Amino acid sequence: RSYNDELQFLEKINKNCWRIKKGFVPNMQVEGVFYVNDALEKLMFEELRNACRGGFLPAMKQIGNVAALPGIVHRSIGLPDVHSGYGFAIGNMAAFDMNDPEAVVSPGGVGFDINCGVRLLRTNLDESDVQPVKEQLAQAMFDHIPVGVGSKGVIPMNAKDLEEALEMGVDWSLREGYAWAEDKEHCEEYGRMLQADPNKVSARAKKRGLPQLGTLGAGNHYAEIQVVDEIFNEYAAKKMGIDHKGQVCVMIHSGSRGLGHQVATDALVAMEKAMKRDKIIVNDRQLACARIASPEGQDYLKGMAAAGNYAWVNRSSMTFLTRQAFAKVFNTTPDDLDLHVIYDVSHNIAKVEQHVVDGKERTLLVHRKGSTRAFPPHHPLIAVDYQLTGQPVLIGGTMGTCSYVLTGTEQGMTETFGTTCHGAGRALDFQDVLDKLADMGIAIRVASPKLVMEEAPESYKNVTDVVNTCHDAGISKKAIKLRPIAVIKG
Ligand SMILES: Nc1nc2c(ncn2[C@@H]2O[C@H](COP(=O)(O)O)[C@@H](O)[C@H]2O)c(=O)[nH]1
Ligand SMILES: [Co+2]
Ligand SMILES: [Co+2]
């Protein structure tokens, strides 16, 4: 196929959405769509054009291949931050009818870092309160939070605790005093997936997992101190405790570390057998999957949920440590600093959700790999404080640019099953990067300084284009813009 031929199946629906017609890839059950603005459009097509003239297929082709998966409903959707990934693209949403016996679960549609995600903390501090002790604060966050490839947990944990954490999620953290009661209330799934079964997490996963529980990791993972730069939705900001520009917040991004990676890996191995036996055909081996009802599909879903709970405990630990560091620098209690959790969302998980599709409300398995749930106003499952706003959505940009808080919308619930973006996304000298941060007034403590070129803001897309695409499309609504002033990296 020539590049021009590829264009035959690509048709622009509206200002910010493209349609991927059936036939782009073989056996598509539904169409594919990708939401982008004029600036994001160029890169999608340039990547497709370069393929006509890595270990992953072009993002566009990955969206179509997921569209060929059995049991899918509605459309295979690529968000504006979409980039190529393992099987599913990072920034993709695919939902499956759980009453269809052909419907599958795909670990590639969740991701190796199971329940990678973001927690947003607010404070009653102002940028003028932090600027004088900025270096001291960053140092304190670094000393307190294990960060880096081989860092061990600070909060001591043994196998029993891990086992309880796999089953209980934030509830273990609450029970032992590391989490506040309100943290659980403002957390997606209330920090606890009930379907988790620690027996479906392997021994190797647990061995890897135990010393990393209570650690940040590396690469994209961060603890970032931010200032509210703009407020787009005053009402929503007020419900999140944010009332003025200058307010200081903390954003934490982490997942399930080695435990989750192993669980994902074990599932992929196990799924090869399931596919042959159950006659499952895929366009791409990275889309290896299992029938939801099969033992392979069920074992993975339960182990995924357990890894999910792990990640919530991990972000809870990070929060406790963060509160501790802030407390020390400012010689006050975390409560007097108003260091409450605004929200905690995943952007790597499969969820069982009720959704109207093809006229009837149905029970779907919603795969969100590199995308974020964004439930609308009046959804029964979200907390009382966000009933009128809709669900907060935490979008980290980069360490040198900006981040956003968005809210879920009814239109998002309709068009994308309440799914929006998760970040800027990857786009298609290390001392320079550090120097630039310093120029900008951004403090930083990094476990591995020579590797910061990889995490430079130039390697990601423009996050403001990504959120504005989702905003104009209507699937999530801008609420708050944040600016980093200090960041911890691995
Ligand atoms: N705020 C902030 N966001 C980041 C940083 N590094 C990566 N991100 C964002 O976090 C998102 C999550 O990454 P992912 O989970 O896809 O690997 C990325 O798409 C990227 O935009 C950082 O240092 N600070
Ligand atoms: Co991650
Ligand atoms: Co992430």
Numbering used by the authors: 3 to 55, 60 to 434, 444 to 505
The authors write:
The human RtcB ligase ortholog RTCB, also referred to as HSPC117 or FAAP, is part of an essential heteropentameric tRNA ligase complex (tRNA-LC), along with the DEAD-box helicase DDX1, as well as FAM98B, CGI-99 (also known as RTRAF or hCLE), and ASHWIN (ASW). The tRNA ligase complex is an essential factor for both tRNA biogenesis and XBP1 mRNA splicing during the unfolded protein response in human cells. By contrast, the RtcB ligases are GTP-dependent enzymes that catalyze the direct joining of RNA strands with terminal 2′,3′>P and 5′-OH. RTCB is the only subunit of tRNA-LC that is essential and sufficient for RNA ligation, but it requires the protein cofactor Archease for multiple-turnover catalysis.
To address this, we determined, at a resolution of 2.3 Å, the crystal structure of human RTCB in complex with a GMP molecule and two divalent cobalt ions bound in the active site. The structure of GMP-bound RTCB likely mimics an on-pathway, product-bound state. The GMP guanosine base makes hydrogen bonding interactions with the sidechains of Glu230RTCB, Ser409RTCB, and Lys504RTCB. The ribose 2′ and 3′ OH groups are hydrogen-bonded with backbone nitrogens of Ala430RTCB and Gly431RTCB, while the phosphate oxygen atoms interact with the sidechains of Asn226RTCB and His428RTCB. The phosphate moiety is further coordinated by the Co2+(A) ion. The two Co2+ ions, referred to as Co2+(A) and Co2+(B), adopt tetrahedral and octahedral coordination geometries, respectively. Co2+(A) is coordinated by His259RTCB, His353RTCB, Cys122RTCB, and the phosphate moiety of GMP, whereas Co2+(B) is coordinated by Asp119RTCB, Cys122RTCB, His227RTCB, and three water molecules. Two adjacent loops found in the vicinity of the active site in RTCB are structurally distinct from PhRtcB: an N-terminal region spanning residues Leu45-Pro64RTCB, which forms an extended α-helix and a loop as compared to a shorter loop (Lys37-Arg42PhRtcB) in PhRtcB, and a segment comprising residues Arg436-Asp444RTCB, which is only partially ordered. The RTCB structure shows that the metal ion A is tetrahedrally coordinated, instead of adopting octahedral coordination as observed in the Mn2+-bound PhRtcB structures. Unlike the prokaryotic RtcB orthologs, human RTCB is active in the presence of Co2+ ions, suggesting that the Co2+-bound RTCB structure represents an on-pathway state and not a catalytically inhibited complex.
